[PDB]
Amino acid sequence: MGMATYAVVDLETTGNQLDFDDIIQIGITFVRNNQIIDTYHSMIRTNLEIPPFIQALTSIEENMLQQAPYFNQVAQEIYDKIKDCIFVAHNVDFDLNFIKKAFKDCNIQYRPKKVIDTLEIFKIAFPTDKSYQLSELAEAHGITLANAHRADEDAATTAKLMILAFEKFEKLPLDTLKQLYYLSKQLKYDLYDIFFEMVRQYDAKPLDKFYEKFEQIIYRKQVDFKKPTTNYNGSLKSLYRKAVDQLGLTYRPQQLYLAETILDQLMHSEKAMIEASLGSGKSLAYLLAALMYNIETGKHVMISTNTKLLQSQLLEKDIPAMNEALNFKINALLIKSKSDYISLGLISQILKDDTSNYEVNILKMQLLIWITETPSGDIQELNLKGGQKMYFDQKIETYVPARHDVHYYNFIKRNAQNIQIGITNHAHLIHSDVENSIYQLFDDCIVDEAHRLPDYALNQVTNELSYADIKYQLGLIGKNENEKLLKAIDQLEKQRILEKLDIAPIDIFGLKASMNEIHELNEQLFSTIFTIINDSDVYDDDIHRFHNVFTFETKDILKDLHAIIDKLNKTLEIFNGISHKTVKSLRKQLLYLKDKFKNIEQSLKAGHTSFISIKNLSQKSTIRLYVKDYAVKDVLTKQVLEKFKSLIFISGTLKFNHSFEAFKQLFNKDVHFNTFEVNTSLQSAKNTSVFIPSDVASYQYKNIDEYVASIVSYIIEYTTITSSKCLVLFTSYKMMHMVQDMLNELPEFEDYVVLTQQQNQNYKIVQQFNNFDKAILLGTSTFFEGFDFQANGIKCVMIAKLPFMNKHNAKYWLMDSEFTSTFKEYVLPDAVTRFRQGLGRLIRNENDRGIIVSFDDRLINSNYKNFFEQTLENYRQKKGDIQQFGKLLRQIQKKK
């Protein structure tokens, strides 16, 4: 057989409708022996108008197609070249179907014997990649993607990657065989044939990257860490000086003060709470103190972070920059929970047969290539999503490790002494000891943005019962004698009857009827909850994503739970006194469902706080039932305060009144802390200004109309006087939408793109400075923290209403029983921290200046005002009519 030729094809069309759209460009790259041997390209002339969206996507104008030929002519020529070449494409259904139609209209029948989809190939070959879009993948692996949206590179770069895959597929022999068998169940795509060919023409050699292989899995032995550190033979003041000298920054004394305070607390066994508003310079101080602890006969130091942008900044930039200055690199690693790391239990996953799940099968193949390249084993390296994510999570939860299975989490424990600088996330920090046992070898930690630590605790303090999870679990068992597990049981009984296996009678009939009954019992449970939702008071969430019911009776819910648990138990009894693997599996799964119900039942019987969530008020299939199984003060103490010898709470906002007693009350044992305040406020306090309008009415949910009208009046005045950016932080989804509607209609906001907050993927923040430097009106609800305001002009932050929480918020519902005065001990402190957070979102560089506008009158006519005007002490305040506001803006703009 002559070696196969690959026709890697890409098409540009007038659209995505096969019956109505024409091919306007075709590109083909021919690959043989992992080398590009030839290319074909042709613009194709159509009589259809090219929609402007397609012209913008492909850069193909109509004038370019006037000298191009119609498909008929090229059709005859093209077919000859690809009629004996394996058809390849990225998402091959598109190209293959369009080419098949265009050939058919020319009386040509194209039926490529072998079809290949690169998208499958790239998923398997490149699992760790965050995207499989061609441009991002090509830049991902150093391929010159050049101009995108072209049938040329889309045929060339795909081919180059296809090559890179085939080049990558040169691994241990038996391994290629594993993927061959797996491929048989992937799709009509005959990539199994491709792997088979490689199996025949395979060249054998051994590698040492894998010192050994686990069972029938091969793995890249994890490279351990060393201890590279040179004593600075000096104090950190000198080190800070030496560093800033090479970094070429400024010698900010307050930044150094922070590093010294952190190091002092770390050197001793002292717990402390530091409040720092350093202008984006905390990262260096933190690491400097850690590596200084290191040089000073110090040990491993941990650092949790509320977001991950800071994590990367210090991990992918600051540490490298310090490496050259220090002349050595202190090994640093992103510490995660045990579940995050992968075990070699993949062999169990390999054994399981799931032909139906095209994804689960691809997951097996992806994991095989991944375990050969991953250096950490973090299961999150792969973008686990959809059924793949659901399956893996279930497997990782039901996994019973044994026989000295190698877990990549143990790597962290072995190199813990060498990693004296380790980073984590607040979410991981609060995880259970059984999942965070590495902390036993990490007794010093510095928490950043610890004001958010209570919020994370609230998320990891509840358990849930979702219709989807029960549906998936029930499906795993099966409904008929031809469905998954139930089918396996039928075969076992058939064998006992015919093959005369030495197995006790298996009542498949009873099991099927039993599982059907369990399904109806489940429907009754969610039907009961849905009836409660309709017969009870329902409160929408702020982001208007879900609707929650808090006050309800759990009587009927518990009755339905009891019945389903009992039926599940009876079903399990039928298969008691048994040992066959199939029935042992069925027993494990059934017991798993039984515990998913019995746990929630136990929590409701224990009097735990519970609430109902529903995503769509019409579909009972979106119902979730939450129960509070822990206390958040409890979690914050047992899992953080009592787990570290030297805790150090660092956050810009940590004090209500003028003490930290409010942040400290979130802990149980009254433990002595050290309070420090590095203000670093400097010019900011004066560069900034505050305005409290006196011509705005009292905020009332009764008539939000006049309030939003006043708010849009102020946005008008500001924007007409100074053509700069503006940021409004609302508390009402309704208010945010109401103002944006008005802003869009008003003619004054033409040439002023308004941006709003979306439930997920809030990337509109970038658009603020995306050529919209003089025209932006970002309206948000809960982004008071995590925003950088960079603008070439005056900055304005408008606080529509004080950031309070309603008594019907999940947070309040799960905290009211943990505070004597929730308002004075939780909601009020929270509002102050949230309000001051937005205030800090105005000034970041003292080079430029800005204004803050606050409309809520409570700041001047409420009893708790003192708490809020405490947050504006370093600022200068002015109250008056919009005209006073106009005069103010002009003065600041004309400050020249």
Place this chain on the structure above:
DNA sequence: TTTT
């Protein structure tokens, strides 16, 4: 002494 809170809110759509």
